Amino acid sequence: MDVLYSLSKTLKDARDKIVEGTLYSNVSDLIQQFNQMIITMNGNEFQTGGIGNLPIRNWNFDFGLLGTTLLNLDANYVETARNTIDYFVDFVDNVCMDEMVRESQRNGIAPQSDSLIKLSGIKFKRINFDNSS
Amino acid sequence: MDVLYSLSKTLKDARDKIVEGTLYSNVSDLIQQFNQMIITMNGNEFQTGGIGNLPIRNWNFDFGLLGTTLLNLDANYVETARNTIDYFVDFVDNVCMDEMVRESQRNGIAPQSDSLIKLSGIKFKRINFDNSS
Amino acid sequence: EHQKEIQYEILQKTIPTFEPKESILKKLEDIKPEQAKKQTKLFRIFEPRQLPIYRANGEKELRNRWYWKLKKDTLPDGDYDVREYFLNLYDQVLTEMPDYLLLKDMAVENKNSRDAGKVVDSETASICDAIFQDEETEGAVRRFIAEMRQRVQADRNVVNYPSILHPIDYAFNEYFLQHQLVEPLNNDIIFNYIPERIRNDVNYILNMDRNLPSTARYIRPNLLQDRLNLHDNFESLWDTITTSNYILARSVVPDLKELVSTEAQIQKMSQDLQLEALTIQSETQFLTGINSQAANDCFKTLIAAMLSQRTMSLDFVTTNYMSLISGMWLLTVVPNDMFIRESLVACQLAIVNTIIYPAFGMQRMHYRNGDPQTPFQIAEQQIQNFQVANWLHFVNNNQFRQVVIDGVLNQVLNDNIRDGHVINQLMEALMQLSRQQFPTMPVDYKRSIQRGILLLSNRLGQLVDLTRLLAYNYETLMACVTMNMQHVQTLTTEKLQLTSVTSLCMLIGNATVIPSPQTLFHYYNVNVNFHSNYNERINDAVAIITAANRLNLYQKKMKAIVEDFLKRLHIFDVARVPDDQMYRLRDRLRLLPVEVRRLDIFNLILMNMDQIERASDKIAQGVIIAYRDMQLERDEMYGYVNIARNLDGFQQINLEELMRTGDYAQITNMLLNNQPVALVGALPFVTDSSVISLIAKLDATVFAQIVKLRKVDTLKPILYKINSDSNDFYLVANYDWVPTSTTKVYKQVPQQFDFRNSMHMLTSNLTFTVYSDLLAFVSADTVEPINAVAFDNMRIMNEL
């Protein structure tokens, strides 16, 4: 679960600190964290939806890491990035919603969805960070 | 006083950004700040309470620091850390409460408690950090 | 011309440019930065030795507890000297920076125990066998040592070997593992380390031949950009770079081929030229020769100039009008933008005046220029013949369209498709010429002039070819330049005799030459290394300087580091580096981050700094005087001694401060009216066993000294290692009594040894194979020259 959290603060602190004009070094510590993610992900496939009117969409990962063009980012850098973020956003949305509908009497404190159950897996823990929310 | 502040944002940004898994280079800038503290403290004795129904608990300092190696964090790393945090938490609580009751006609704007008066000392100033609250 | 020299040189002393031309090339092809960096030893700082221990008031208790001690304990006297000492460690750390690591290469037999237990390194081994036998070591110890077996996983390449280091040691070696700075390697990556361009340049063939084990591993090249904008102030050094980058270029630029026999052309030339026809100033237009060379020189020279972002002038020869015509060629192409304003000055006006204007009949007012903004231009606004008129705007523009960001960050001021191979420029440069045939002055003039012009025109069918050539070449070579390249007005020129120019021109046939594959790489490779070195040293540099500051080393900082820096860069010979330059260089350096690597380590050293210093056997931090009979304390290790683990209750006087700043006797007064006081920092040391001594109150002596003259180096203080043994002086415990030490010291006690906590496990990868050079794996051929093509795709060099 905590996993999930990160995924976002990653994107927020991303769609926020990554803009046309900021010095690289203001995101050095960040950039890293990001890439680290892409890696852990790529390869594994997911299933969301499959209930009520909720659509069953299939997500797959195949992304290239992030460059580092020195001395403040050039517009081009952003757009090639934003394109990658938007797939994760539209993803998480579907992930949240899918686990935001399932309920369980016995153990209704743990992950239900096929999507999240897979995240609590150990091979992903490598992402967790900045738990200030 | 401002001193006090830090002590916390230190712990929060700590009990928050230090979790099983995260990449070190997200806390490099942090870890440091932390240690710096332990040092300044170790070798000091404090005392809180003494008024009304407020217990008089005593505190001492003598702690080891934290590794700097490790790409990522292993569970073991955390637990050996959390154990040290919990002593500071239970500490600050007692520190706050002790200075949160005393009032002074004269300088009701200055520190009161034996605990805090000692903090405004110069030798502790080396701990200030991130005043955004 | 002697007067010209002295000064032309007084300038050359403000240029860290090495002397000979060639002498520079070597320096480059020589820079072999890349280096596999491996290591053997685990690396520590301290092993654990046995030591005698006497219980309170006791003799050698017979036991010998294990304590940690420093291998190589060389610590200076004085807080300051200490700080400097550590600093050297930083330098040592970097020079030994193990880029990667493996453990099999350190395997060792854990002599004792079932399960073929293998352990980390030699020291690890020793220790085990050692303790195994110190009979007073909990049954759990042998056990652990015993059964603890290595961890070998064939698949995945994992190796977890049991080891024993130390808190501060694990500290190091650890990060060294977590920063193996070694990324994988797939055919695809090799393919990719190739300019996004070349691959698509048909003319060049690509192919793979060797495979790649999942064992493949390389080290990032690290090609950050400029970081340092030398483009706006360090002229002296740019000139030296340009020069360099320039020679480099010539070394590459392919030599030409298939030229027209020198003799043949010049001969039809005399027929056409009508040389000796009255005109007094003969045989100045034919010093043109040695063209079989001049062209090769003019050619090379031209490229490098460009690439290297150099700027030049022209060994111009006013009379020789022809030589001028060709000039027009030059501007038709080479973006005047990179031509010191002046040499262009002469050239144009020489054209403008002794040409066009009068032979064309226009301004018979020849032209009067003081210093507007581009004399060559303005001519436009007032010329009535379109053809002529287009040349003008295009030439006064063609500003070397300084705007590009290709294949990922490569600002390489580009050039017109037009020029490229649209060429027409040439066709138009000609058409305009095709209608310059008319009146004004003597006959032998137009006759001679126009006739020469025609030789440009006919040949024009070919002159085209020239355009294409360069177009490609520059447009090719360039691709493989990492260093960015802002256009700058170099301080130095480069002479280009219209002689050669003119030759190249009417003297090139259906030749067709291009950069040999192997050639190209070699080029990349170099700039690469160089870069790597620049960037790297930069980091090495910064790291130090910053450390130099918190490490309060208020001394060297200026030059010291800078000197070494430049030297390693090779390219230039310091010395002739104006002083405003070296310092300014620091001014810029000090304002940058620090390669995590570098930085991350210093942060570590500082945290343990304190601990080391007191950990040493010789030297403690300051002493105390109380002129109050004091009770000697007792510690298991030193026996009966006068140690104090804490100051508090007595002023502190930074020896360092005092010594460095002279004395005001504040101390002199306190000592004199005999007052409680403390001294802080690192200090000499003295052990003594003379029970008697204590009685004689020796410790209250040494001090008076200082006073004399400042100094305070000669301040050896005293300790009384009074063990209930090695002290012949023991008529002490035989008499009821207690130690009356008037003084004691700060050296905190060494650390006890606790196995458990020093035993760490080890995460090491297993079995690599490191590769350098790279490229090599690339198989590449080349079409036959007669079949080239540019962006054009029609065919470079196409005048069958």
From Swiss-Prot, chains A, B:
Any one GO CC term of the record: viral intermediate capsid
Question: Per UniProt, what is one GO molecular function of this protein?
Answer: host cell surface receptor binding
What GO biological process terms does the UniProt entry carry, in alphabetical order? fusion of virus membrane with host plasma membrane
Q: Where in the cell?
A: Virion
- What domain of life is recorded for the organism? Viruses
- How does the record describe the protein's post-translational processing? The N-terminus is blocked. Sumoylated with SUMO1 and SUMO2. Sumoylation of viral proteins seems to have a positive role on viral replication.
Q: What is the effect of changing residue 70 to N?
A: Loss of in vitro DLP assembly and transcriptase activity, and almost complete loss of interaction with VP2. Loss of in vitro DLP transcriptase activity, no effect on particle assembly
Region Interaction with the inner capsid protein VP2, as annotated, extends over 62-73
Alphabetically list the UniProt keywords: Calcium, Capsid protein, Intermediate capsid protein, Metal-binding, Ubl conjugation, Virion, Zinc
Say what the protein does: Intermediate capsid protein that self assembles to form an icosahedral capsid with a T=13 symmetry, which consists of 230 trimers of VP6, with channels at each of its five-fold vertices. This capsid constitutes the middle concentric layer of the viral mature particle. The innermost VP2 capsid and the intermediate VP6 capsid remain intact following cell entry to protect the dsRNA from degradation and to prevent unfavorable antiviral responses in the host cell during all the replication cycle of the virus.
UniProt family annotation: Belongs to the rotavirus VP6 family.
Something else known: The VP6 trimer contains a zinc ion located at the center of the molecule. The zinc ion is not essential for either trimerization or transcription activity of the DLP. Zinc-depleted VP6 has an increased sensitivity to proteases.
Assembly and partners? Answer: Homotrimer. Interacts with the inner capsid protein VP2. Interacts with the outer capsid glycoprotein VP7. Interacts with the outer capsid protein VP5*.
Q: What is this protein called?
A: Intermediate capsid protein VP6
Report the source organism: Rotavirus A (strain RVA/Cow/France/RF/1975/G6P6[1])
* Stretch of the intact protein here: 1 to 133 of 397
Swiss-Prot record, chain C:
Keyword list, A-Z: Capsid protein, Inner capsid protein, Repeat, RNA-binding, T=2 icosahedral capsid protein, Ubl conjugation, Virion
InterPro entries listed in its UniProt record: Rotavirus_VP2 (IPR007779)
Description of post-translational modifications: Sumoylated with SUMO1 and SUMO2. Sumoylation of viral proteins seems to have a positive role on viral replication.
Entry keyword RNA-binding: yes
Q: Where is this site: Interaction with the intermediate capsid protein VP6?
A: 140, 144, 148, 759, 761
Which domain of life does this protein belong to? Viruses
Principal subcellular localization: virion
Q: List, alphabetically, the HAMAP family matched.
A: Rota_VP2, Rota_VP2_A
Q: Which protein is depicted?
A: Inner capsid protein VP2
